[PDB]
Design a binder for this molecule. Structure first.
Ligand SMILES: [Cl-]
Ligand SMILES: [Cl-]
Ligand SMILES: [Cl-]
Ligand SMILES: [Cl-]
Lengths: 267, 270
């Protein structure tokens, strides 16, 4: 009911973590506890780097990396959304009882749906314009919201028809590179994602934190978009976003507390 | 009043010749801070000649003028507009002789003996409400709605000023915040949520200053206790609520945040 914050943790290496661009399972564990301490409700755990330029590791490598992280978060009572598009990793994560699966491919392979149907984990179904084609960087001609709605029309039908109950679904319309090169495309979705909540009567997750289009609206480099991110997340929250996936839970937590305190005053 | 949001960057001179990169800024360090804040997106520098900490010993008007004179020199040469934030009439008089763009008085210009000097200047006037109202020990407004008490303050003070020859459109209304409103964070929250009532009742622009006010600390959680994120959220809320001016210690996060909200609004309108 209240905004749920996903804290981003991406395991980047098998054994060497240096507190910068390299994250190992031991230190992934410390980052997860730190993000919960800063106000996250869930750790959105990625078994590999987010950048498409790194060599994609195997489902076997993803499982080996997340296995010790899942043991300790389960011990801590720390909820996990397992962020992987690889079905063998998804199946392993479901066997460990994760709270969510988060698939940047949006669960496109119907042969896998019986395994999704027999679990209770919630599914973050993400839209992208790539849809499996790295070369495809834009949606088809027309209104981006029209194409996203039509994507979810078809995919929700496929998933729920296979027995995945619709109240397990969380809709992620995509953001930044998953929508197109132009900042206007991401701004349209950030402004209009509640059209999807209303169309489907389903919750929406957004991930805007540190996305490149924010740097276009500010003119600053990578380590200076903290305020633009907070403003974008607060605007999403005020627009009714049910989940926000972020790198820095504390500024968002603090900002939300101010907004909550203001509306409670005007009641 | 229909123009875009105007940002005042806060710069206080807190020493005569001591600069430590932290709380103490001599005039040359205040010049460097003023220049930085405009580069970070301020439109005007709200320049205080002394510490705004109530536990600092107040300095004489002679000391205030000596501190601000070289800062006004430098900012005039830079073309940087100044709101001179001082409550001492002698300092205000000096600022007016230097042609500052605004005067900003935490006492709200309460002394009619000074009005003839206000009336023959062109400086815009930031008229600040406080529950102290000279009674510095007074910590709370009288019984009733705080917003009703603020409106009644501006009712009388606007009439007093405009009748003395100060044209109405020189006036900017600051309802006060934090200590100037009361001890309870709910009281500052009430003004932050409802100041639009003052814009409607007087048809005058409203200035808000929430930056780093202690009441925000009650809304941060457990942790180191940084207030920058809570400050930005309150300032963005004020902007969305129609604030004409925002006075802040950090213009850059606010400019960045406003640019996001503007692009979103433009997206929705088109
Ligand atoms: Cl287990
Ligand atoms: Cl819903
Ligand atoms: Cl201080
Ligand atoms: Cl001059």
């Amino acid at each position: 009911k209240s905004l749920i914050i996903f804290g981003i943790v991406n395991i980047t290496s098998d054994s060497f973590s240096d507190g910068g661009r390299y994250l190992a399972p031991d230190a992934a564990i410390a980052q997860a506890r730190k993000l919960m301490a800063e106000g996250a409700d869930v750790i959105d755990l990625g078994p590999a780097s987010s950048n498409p330029d790194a060599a994609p590791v195997s489902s076997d490598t993803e499982i080996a990396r997340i296995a010790p992280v899942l043991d300790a978060l389960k011990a801590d009572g720390i909820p996990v959304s397992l962020d992987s598009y690889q079905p063998a990793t998804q199946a392993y994560a479901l066997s460990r009882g994760v709270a969510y699966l988060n698939d940047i491919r949006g669960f496109p392979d119907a042969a896998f749906y019986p395994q999704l149907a027999k679990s209770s984990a919630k599914l973050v179904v993400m839209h992208s314009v790539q849809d499996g084609q790295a070369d495809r960087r834009e949606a088809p001609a027309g209104d981006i919201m029209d194409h996203i709605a039509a994507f979810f029309d078809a995919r929700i039908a496929a998933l729920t028809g296979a027995g995945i109950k619709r109240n397990r679904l969380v809709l992620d319309p995509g953001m930044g590179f998953f929508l197109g090169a132009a900042p206007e495309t991401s701004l349209s979705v950030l402004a209009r994602f509640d059209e999807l909540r209303l169309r489907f009567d389903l919750p929406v997750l957004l991930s805007v934190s540190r996305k490149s289009f924010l740097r276009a609206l500010t003119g600053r480099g990578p380590g200076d978009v903290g305020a633009a991110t907070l403003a974008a997340e607060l605007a999403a929250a005020a627009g009714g976003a049910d989940f926000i996936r972020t790198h820095e839970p504390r500024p968002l937590r603090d900002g939300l507390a101010v907004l909550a305190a203001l509306k409670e005053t005007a009641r």
